[PDB]
Amino acid sequence: AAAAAMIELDLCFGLLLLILFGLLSLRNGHVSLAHIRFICQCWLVMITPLEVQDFALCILTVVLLQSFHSFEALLFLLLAYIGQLYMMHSCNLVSFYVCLEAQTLCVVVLCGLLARGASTSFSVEAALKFLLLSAMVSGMALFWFSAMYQRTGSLDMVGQETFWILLVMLFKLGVAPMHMWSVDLYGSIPKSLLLYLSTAPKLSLFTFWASSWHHDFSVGVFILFSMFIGSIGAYGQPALRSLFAYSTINEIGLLLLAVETAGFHTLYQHLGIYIITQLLLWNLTDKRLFALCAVSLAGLPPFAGFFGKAWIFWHAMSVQAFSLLAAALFCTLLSLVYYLRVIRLFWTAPVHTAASFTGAPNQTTLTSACAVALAFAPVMLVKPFVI
Amino acid sequence: YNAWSPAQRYFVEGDHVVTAEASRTFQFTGLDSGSFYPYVIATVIATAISTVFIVAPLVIAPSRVDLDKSSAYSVSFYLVSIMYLLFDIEIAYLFPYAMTHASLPMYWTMNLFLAILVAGFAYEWGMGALEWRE
Amino acid sequence: GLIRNIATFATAVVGWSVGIPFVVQARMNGYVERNLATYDAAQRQKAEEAAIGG
Amino acid sequence: GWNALPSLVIITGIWTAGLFALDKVQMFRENKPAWANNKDGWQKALYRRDWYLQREEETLAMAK
Amino acid sequence: TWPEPPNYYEAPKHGFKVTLENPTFPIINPDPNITDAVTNMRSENWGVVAGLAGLGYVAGYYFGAKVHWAKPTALFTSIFLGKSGLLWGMSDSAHRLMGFKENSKEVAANLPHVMQ
Amino acid sequence: MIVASILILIVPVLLSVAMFTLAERTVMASMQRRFGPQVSGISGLLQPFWDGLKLGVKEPVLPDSSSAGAFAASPMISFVLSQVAWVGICISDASFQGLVIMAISSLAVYGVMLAGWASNSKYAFLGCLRSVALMVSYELSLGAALLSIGLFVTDGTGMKCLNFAEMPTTPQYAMLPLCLIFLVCILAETKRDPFDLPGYNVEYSSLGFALFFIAEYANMAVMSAIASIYFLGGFSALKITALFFAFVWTRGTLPRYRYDQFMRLGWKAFLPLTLAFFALHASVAI
Amino acid sequence: YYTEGEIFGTTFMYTTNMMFWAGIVGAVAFRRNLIILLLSAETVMLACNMNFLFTAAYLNDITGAIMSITITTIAACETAIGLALCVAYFHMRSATDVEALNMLK
Amino acid sequence: AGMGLSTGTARCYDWYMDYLKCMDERKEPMIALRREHCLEWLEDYNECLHREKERTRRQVIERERRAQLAGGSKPA
Amino acid sequence: MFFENSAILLCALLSIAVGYTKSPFMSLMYSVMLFINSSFVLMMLGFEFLALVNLLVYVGALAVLFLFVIMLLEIPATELRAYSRGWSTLGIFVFIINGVFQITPSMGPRGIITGLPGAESITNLGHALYLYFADLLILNSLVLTVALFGRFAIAPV
Ligand SMILES: CCCCCCCCCCCCCCCCCC(=O)O[C@@H](COC(=O)CCCCCCCCCCCCCCC)COP(=O)(O)OC[C@H](O)CO
Ligand SMILES: COC1=C(OC)C(=O)C(C/C=C(\C)CC/C=C(\C)CC/C=C(\C)CC/C=C(\C)CCC=C(C)C)=C(C)C1=O
């Protein structure tokens, strides 16, 4: 009986109808597609199950779709969402491989498609490098899956070959020293895909890790590499895109410290606060709120980034992971300097914000002003909330 | 290939079977059912024949050196090649369906597969990508 | 030249077809030797545990 | 026309004689007029068992 | 060693998603068809289908009016949300018929000769 | 015995290719109210043999600006693939024989593209891509036709296959439009009329050129045997001659398409028709 | 000490291991173009596909064949997209680079 | 995922099911603690898979056969 | 079994040869030889249909796209530092260590395995693909859809 699979049939039927509707709308010469975007958001809601993580991903992708305008980009983001959703439910390396590869192909094509102006060739260059680096990591995953399949005779993810699969997962999160594909991507690709790349796949992969993964090894050297390299790199790079790429490497090192000491509640709290800050960061038009992102990414006390860092520090001290904790505290002391550089650049400066001329007047002030109210979330964060 | 174990020889003992297998004639109704071995021999023999065709006019033909005798007298192909690649993969997927006595849920799964195929194809038709004006 | 390249390819194919099976044979011989050492050590441990284990 | 008839007759005769000769040669190789049939795993198992048991019958015959 | 003689004409009866439950309610029909699923559907399911269709019509009219294409957008969005709701309702009815959900209303209506 | 069987197969293939190219000349002449070759031997029966021997003692032109290996390899690859495909027709018992021949004929594209890469002509590079585009475009309709054919091919034990000896010995009346599409696809693969616009062998002389034409006519005979097996209830000498006569008859009476015209035909007419027929036959076969 | 089947199996596994590392390393080591890098990625995929098919025969199991079909699909899609991007980048940067498709120079 | 390539199931599927049944019937709060009590079934499943111990026995018999022919070459 | 083992070992030689040569055309020719030889290797294991899929997809379709791209984009620069710059000794050392000596093999502690031919059943494959792995089949279709749309969007205008 197939009566337990109506959501899958609904997914496929919705894709079949959406392609035909997008074709009919384009035969009329419509230069805007807000109706297509609303149908895409409805389809996103209709295929998502009733778990916390699934709906967090769903609501995140509904918010992200407001920064994309063409039909093909919307289709690629939907088919990347299918991989992102179904990776959280993957209990093998077969589905794991297919979901990861679908996401990689969608990201590569979007990086090629959306570039404009003088930065087109730089974006295509960085997309090619990302594709080549992704191909060999995919080959490593397939090779060691074949080794595990031959040794165990089954699809269980146990044994020594899980160390290389773990390295595949660490590549997909931009963990140093395999971090330079993300550093290349941050310097050229436009802001909407940078917003997409810093939020949704990290959530999808960490939920797969929380749900169906065990390894008998450690990730401590990659924690050290990510934290020290990210902090020193963001201290040393004057371009703002490289600053935010290296600060992202530092944040993924903190999330790996939360993974390594168990306690995924602190991981989920810090990831949620980080995702809301990212949603504020890449949609800013008034540059004074760039200082709020700075004080809430430096871990300064009353804002929500402090709470996200401080439960990670608390659980690390609870299980006595002293050396990694000391390295994390040193890199936190270093991170403050370049977040202060951000504050010097964009707060202690005269205010200029250009008006719109061709309509759409400051079109994402709702989301940015809503996400700035991360100064009111700390009242709920101090309680036993995320567990 | 020859069998290397008593279990592979149906537990027949002796030395007559080993020599008889190593010096057997090729037989589709003996030990070589569905074998694809004549395809290799055909390649070797035809390569020999075409090499003899290539070499022979270098001996039995006249030749004169001249500097003028040894001289010369779009993106649609990208579309065709990539579309052919994807459609060939899809037909290769459809081939295990046609080689089975399929039940009704197999039929409806296959039709969902074909529907996704033809939906992408019809989108590229409607956007004017199969009109080869350029 | 064409004849030189065809001769070099034929030489490389024949040399690869004769040389690599010796590498594989040496590797398999090393694995057999280490496995026999492991079997003998296991038998020694079993005899020791029978001796002081009753 | 009448000039096109000899080549068209010769093509048929060539293919008839060649297929007859190839049939006789492959019939001498295989000794049964169903060698080209499709065979699944059960039929392959049956033929391989038959071959090995024929070899065993030959081995046991040269002992009496 | 000797394999089983294959049955080429018999395909396994298998759906790709397996429920891993036994039903905890009486089983009326272990395998209902689409007619069986629609003819034993409750009124709340039809209500949520009509609510989804109405919301789809109104929202499609709003979004399709920005490109002056409001009526076909409203019709398409209504059908899209309505078929989502209809698949949900048919699945709920089939699960009640198979015994995986509460079916006290369905047992007293689907067995005319096995009423009491 | 396998080498003997293969050589006994190879002999009538080459003899038949010579007689096909003569019969094409003479039938094309008879439609045009003339005679065709009659002088060269009695009833012109030595003309292909003297063409072959004339090309044998012809000077081989090796251009000293090309890559000699690929230039030599292109007609050898074409000829070898034609002979191997004939062996797959007659000296095989494989389960997926039609898939084997489809795979071999998909390899035949390489001789055209190696000739296009090797020779340093401006328009050889221009025409090789067009010829490859035509062959590539019609291969998909051939594959979907094979999908429709294989839905009804079952052997005695109940297994579905593409084995030629298990095909029925009656004409497939239910698949007449698919048979017509198959025949026009054969015409498109062999670059005949009405698809003969693209040539690629403009720099080849003597026996390399002879290898090109022997490969072309042998591939035509392969596709004729395949069509007679799939649709006409078996492989026979009369069916080979009748289908060859039909191809020459079409070449006598029709003009050719432009490049974009047969591209639109193959990508907007033949592929959707074969896929729709596959869906209908799958619905019937349940 | 060992049989002909064991020689055949160990030779297969040694061959595929050297194939995998050849595809991973060699075109980068010889400082080749992006087109040859994509070809070597196809070599990596072929090594994994052969390993899966060997294991599927070895265990009498279906999962290797499913993985084989999936690997062919994903590898061809990624390769086609990469070649399209290579052509686009070459046409964007050939006016000032000449050797634009070689990033290992 | 345990389906056979030419048969209904794989050749060592039932050994795997024996091991998983043992793991199912234990009550320890950790998988690593439950694994210590089902090591015999895991060993039999590994012996089904690769036959390392049968190969080891054959290697030992071959070592003794090579020893009884070099050190012992006794003529009649 | 000399020719079968030699045909198995030839695949690694062709894998090295793809990157070793300086001509891109010759690299593609080596790849075509490798895929044909590997399709014949897969048929030693008993796979008839999947070997034909290997041939039909990789040699028939993908290598044609490779040869079109190479022939459209490669003006001869083999002298232009493709010969004059050589190769990387560190990369060659990595290849030797990992693929010749094989310090981290896929079989791990095992060093000997018995190769066993299979008997491919396409009825079993059809049953598996269209009943047991049907969700993976549909997601493969979605990946092919991504490829088709993405190529047609990325085609240089
Ligand atoms: C414009 C869109 C409108 C859509 C809504 C209206 C259209 C109707 C919806 C389609 C039909 C109803 C939904 C499916 C009904 C299944 C219930 C059932 O049992 O029906 C048959 C079930 O057969 C099917 O048709 C099964 C459909 C299989 C679909 C397989 C694909 C599922 C989706 C996979 C997607 C993968 C996920 C992608 C993302 C990772 C057989 O009925 P029976 O068991 O009573 O008959 C017995 C007889 O002997 C035959 O079994
Ligand atoms: C309008 O279409 C046509 C063309 O344009 C496409 C042509 O170009 C040609 C001319 C080209 C020809 C005939 C070349 C192709 C055929 C050949 C080489 C014949 C092959 C025959 C063989 C191998 C058998 C002959 C050899 C024998 C009998 C061996 C002899 C040995 C001894 C005596 C010891 C023709 C006739 C033609 O109609």
Instruction: Report the C-alpha gap between A81 and A76 in whole angstroms.
Output: 9
The interface residues of chain F toward chain E in range 159-188, judged by CB-CB distance below 8 A, are 159-160
Q: In DSSP terms, which residues pair with F154 in a beta bridge?
A: F160
Instruction: Report the C-alpha gap between A134 and A172 in whole angstroms.
Output: 9
Task: Tell whether A54 is within 8 A of chain G (Cβ).
Answer: no
- From F254, F12, F219, F245, select the one nearest D4 (Cα to Cα): F245
Helix (H) or strand (E) holding I61: none
Q: Are residues A216 and A99 in contact, defined by beta-carbon separation less than 8 angstroms?
A: no
- From B100, B96, B128, select the one nearest B113 (Cα to Cα): B96
Instruction: Report the C-alpha gap between A202 and G14 in whole angstroms.
Output: 37
**Which ligand has the shortest distance to the CA of F19?**
2
What string of DSSP letters covers A65-120? Answer: GGG--SHHHHHHHHHHHHHHHHHTT--SHHHHHHHHHHHHHHHHHHHHHS--GGGH
- From A222, A173, A226, A170, select the one nearest A199 (Cα to Cα): A173
Instruction: Report the C-alpha gap between A66 and F220 in whole angstroms.
Output: 57
Q: Are residues E38 and A27 in contact, defined by beta-carbon separation less than 8 angstroms?
A: no
What string of DSSP letters covers E33-85? Answer: -HHHHHHT--HHHHHHHHHHHHHHHHHHHHHHTTTT-HHHHHHHHHHHHHHHH
Task: Give me the phi and psi of A188, to 5 degrees please.
Answer: -130, -40
Beta-carbon contacts of residue G89 (< 8 Å; ≥ 6 apart): A121, A124, A125, A128, G100, G101
Interface test with F, best of D23, D38, D39, D47 (most F CBs within 10 A): D38
Residue nearest to atom 45 of ligand 1 (CA): E33
In a 10 Å sphere around its CB, with 0-12 CB exposed, 13-18 middle and 19+ buried, how is residue H47 labelled? Answer: middle
CA distance F260 to chain D (A): 36
Helix (H) or strand (E) holding A338: helix A322-346
E strands, chain D, where?
none
Breakpoints of chain A, after residues (C–N > 2.5 Å):
none
Cis peptide before A177 (omega within 30 of 0): yes
Pocket test for ligand 1, best of A9, A43, A88 (most atoms within 8 A of CB): A9
Q: In DSSP terms, which residues pair with F240 in a beta bridge?
A: none
**Other C-beta atoms lying within 10 Å of the C-beta of residue H67:** 10
Distance from the alpha carbon of residue F17 to the mean position of ligand 2, in angstroms: 7
What string of DSSP letters covers B85-114? Answer: HHHHHHHHHHHHHHTS---HHHHHHHHHHH
**Other C-beta atoms lying within 10 Å of the C-beta of residue A351:** 9
Task: Tell whether H41 is within 8 A of chain A (Cβ).
Answer: no
Query: 3-state SS string over chain F?
Result: CHHHHHHHHHHHHHHHHHHHHHHHHHHHHHHCCCCCCCCCCHHHCCHHHHHHHHHHCCCCCCCCCCCHHHHHHHHHHHHHHHHHHHHHHHCCCCCCHHHHHHHHHHHCHHHHHHHHHHCCCHHHHHHHHHHHHHHHHHHHHHHHHHHHHHCCCECCCCCECCCHHHCCCCCCHHHHHHHHHHHHHHHHHCCCCCCCCCCCCCCCCCHHHHHHHHHHHHHHHHHHHHHHHHHCCCCCHHHHHHHHHHHHHHHHHCCCCCHHHHHHHHHHHHHHHHHHHHHHHHHHHC
- Gyration radius from chain A CA atoms: 21
Q: Are residues A12 and B112 in contact, defined by beta-carbon separation less than 8 angstroms?
A: yes
Instruction: Report the C-alpha gap between I147 and F163 in whole angstroms.
Output: 34
Beta-carbon contacts of residue F200 (< 8 Å; ≥ 6 apart): F112, F115, F116, F124, F127, F128, F131
Rounded-to-10 torsion of CA A247, A252, A258, A260: -130
Q: Are residues A124 and G92 in contact, defined by beta-carbon separation less than 8 angstroms?
A: yes
Closest chain E residue to the Cα of A47, Cα to Cα: E84
Cis peptide before F60 (omega within 30 of 0): no
Q: Are residues A195 and A67 in contact, defined by beta-carbon separation less than 8 angstroms?
A: yes
Contacts of F144 in chain B (CB under 8 A): 91
Task: Give me the phi and psi of F119, to 5 degrees please.
Answer: -65, 140
How many residues appear in chain B?
Answer: 134
Q: Which two tokens stand for residue I143?
A: 């990946």
DSSP single-letter state for residue A356: P
Interface test with A, best of E71, E84, E92 (most A CBs within 10 A): E84
Instruction: Report the C-alpha gap between A327 and A346 in whole angstroms.
Output: 29
Contacts of G63 in chain H (CB under 8 A): 1, 3
Instruction: Report the C-alpha gap between A5 and G93 in whole angstroms.
Output: 49
Query: 3-state SS string over G75-93?
Result: HHHHHHHHHHHHHHHHHHH
Q: What letter represents residue D45's amino acid?
A: A
The answer for B36, left when phi > 0, alpha when psi is -120 to 50, beta otherwise, is left
Q: Which two tokens stand for residue G40?
A: 């070597």
Q: Are residues A34 and A48 in contact, defined by beta-carbon separation less than 8 angstroms?
A: no
Q: Are residues A190 and A118 in contact, defined by beta-carbon separation less than 8 angstroms?
A: no
DSSP single-letter state for residue A361: T
Contact at CB, H63 and C36, closer than 8 angstroms = yes
In a 10 Å sphere around its CB, with 0-12 CB exposed, 13-18 middle and 19+ buried, how is residue F62 labelled? Answer: middle
Task: Tell whether E3 is within 8 A of chain H (Cβ).
Answer: yes
Q: What letter represents residue I95's amino acid?
A: F
CB of E11 closer than 6 A to ligand 1? no
Sign of CA dihedral H40, H45, H46, H51: positive
Distance of CA A351 to the CA centre of its chain: 31
Beta-carbon contacts of residue I136 (< 8 Å; ≥ 6 apart): A94, A95, A98, G66, G70
Contact at CB, H1 and A153, closer than 8 angstroms = no
Q: How far is CA H49 from CA A150, A154, A358, I114, in A?
A: 9, 10, 70, 11
- From F247, F168, F214, D2, select the one nearest F239 (Cα to Cα): F247
- From A185, A186, A260, select the one nearest A222 (Cα to Cα): A260
For residue E30, give the 3-state DSSP assignment: coil
DSSP single-letter state for residue A122: H
Instruction: Report the C-alpha gap between B10 and D55 in whole angstroms.
Output: 11
Q: Are residues B19 and D54 in contact, defined by beta-carbon separation less than 8 angstroms?
A: no
Distance of CA F89 to the CA centre of its chain: 13
Q: Are residues B83 and B121 in contact, defined by beta-carbon separation less than 8 angstroms?
A: no
Distance of CA F152 to the CA centre of its chain: 25
Distance from the alpha carbon of residue A3 to the mean position of ligand 1, in angstroms: 8
Contacts of C25 in chain I (CB under 8 A): none
The interface residues of chain I toward chain B in range 21-50, judged by CB-CB distance below 8 A, are 40, 43, 48-49
In chain G, the largest separation of any two C-alpha atoms, in whole Å, equals 64
Query: 3-state SS string over A132-182?
Result: HHHHHHHHHHHHHHHHHHHHHCCCCCCCCCHHHHHHHHHHHCCCCCCCHHH
Question: Are B and G close enough to touch, i.e. 3+ CB pairs under 8 angstroms?
Answer: yes
Q: How far is CA F158 from CA B101, E32, F268, H59, I39, in A?
A: 9, 31, 37, 45, 28
Q: Which two tokens stand for residue F142?
A: 């051939």
Task: Give me the phi and psi of H72, to 5 degrees please.
Answer: -125, 110
Q: What letter represents residue B53's amino acid?
A: F
Residue nearest to atom 20 of ligand 2 (CA): F18
CB of A82 closer than 6 A to ligand 1? yes
Beta-carbon contacts of residue B6 (< 8 Å; ≥ 6 apart): B12, B13
Tokens 């090594």 locate to: G47
Instruction: Report the C-alpha gap between H55 and A373 in whole angstroms.
Output: 69
CA distance G30 to chain A (A): 16
Closest chain E residue to the Cα of A2, Cα to Cα: E15
DSSP single-letter state for residue H76: -
Q: What letter represents residue A66's amino acid?
A: Q
Closest chain D residue to the Cα of F237, Cα to Cα: D12
To 10 degrees, what angle do helices G4-29 and I2-20 make? 10
- From A26, I37, H17, E104, select the one nearest B122 (Cα to Cα): A26
CB of F196 closer than 6 A to ligand 2? no
**Other C-beta atoms lying within 10 Å of the C-beta of residue C5:** 12
Q: In DSSP terms, which residues pair with H9 in a beta bridge?
A: H3
Instruction: Report the C-alpha gap between A26 and B127 in whole angstroms.
Output: 8
Distance of CA E52 to the CA centre of its chain: 15
**Other C-beta atoms lying within 10 Å of the C-beta of residue A318:** 12
Q: Are residues E6 and I123 in contact, defined by beta-carbon separation less than 8 angstroms?
A: yes
Contact at CB, D51 and B17, closer than 8 angstroms = no
Q: Are residues I111 and G10 in contact, defined by beta-carbon separation less than 8 angstroms?
A: yes
Task: Tell whether F174 is within 8 A of chain C (Cβ).
Answer: no
Tokens 């997809």 locate to: I57
Residue nearest to atom 39 of ligand 1 (CA): I139
**Other C-beta atoms lying within 10 Å of the C-beta of residue I85:** 12
Instruction: Report the C-alpha gap between A232 and A230 in whole angstroms.
Output: 6
In a 10 Å sphere around its CB, with 0-12 CB exposed, 13-18 middle and 19+ buried, how is residue H37 labelled? Answer: middle
Q: Are residues I58 and I50 in contact, defined by beta-carbon separation less than 8 angstroms?
A: no
Sign of CA dihedral F115, F117, F121, F122: positive
Q: Are residues G89 and A188 in contact, defined by beta-carbon separation less than 8 angstroms?
A: no
What's the reported resolution, in angstroms, to a tenth? 2.5
Instruction: Report the C-alpha gap between F143 and B95 in whole angstroms.
Output: 10
Interface test with I, best of A16, A79, A144, A155 (most I CBs within 10 A): A79
CB of F244 closer than 6 A to ligand 2? no
Instruction: Report the C-alpha gap between G23 and I95 in whole angstroms.
Output: 10
- From A148, A278, A267, select the one nearest A211 (Cα to Cα): A267
To 10 degrees, what angle do helices D5-30 and F2-31 make? 170
Q: Are residues A113 and I154 in contact, defined by beta-carbon separation less than 8 angstroms?
A: yes
Q: Which two tokens stand for residue F58?
A: 């012809």
Q: Are residues A11 and A49 in contact, defined by beta-carbon separation less than 8 angstroms?
A: no
In a 10 Å sphere around its CB, with 0-12 CB exposed, 13-18 middle and 19+ buried, how is residue C16 labelled? Answer: middle
CA distance I64 to chain B (A): 7
Question: Are G and H close enough to touch, i.e. 3+ CB pairs under 8 angstroms?
Answer: yes
CA distance B10 to chain I (A): 16
In a 10 Å sphere around its CB, with 0-12 CB exposed, 13-18 middle and 19+ buried, how is residue G28 labelled? Answer: buried
Q: How far is CA F209 from CA A54, B53, F213, in A?
A: 65, 10, 6
For residue A303, give the 3-state DSSP assignment: coil
Closest chain F residue to the Cα of I54, Cα to Cα: F103
Instruction: Report the C-alpha gap between D44 and B27 in whole angstroms.
Output: 12
Q: Which two tokens stand for residue A132?
A: 């080549």
Sign of CA dihedral F124, F127, F133, F136: negative
Distance of CA A83 to the CA centre of its chain: 14
Q: Which two tokens stand for residue D4?
A: 């096109």
CB of A13 closer than 6 A to ligand 1? yes
Q: Which chains touch E (3 or more CB pairs under 8 A)?
A: A, B, D, F, H, I
Q: Are residues F254 and F195 in contact, defined by beta-carbon separation less than 8 angstroms?
A: no
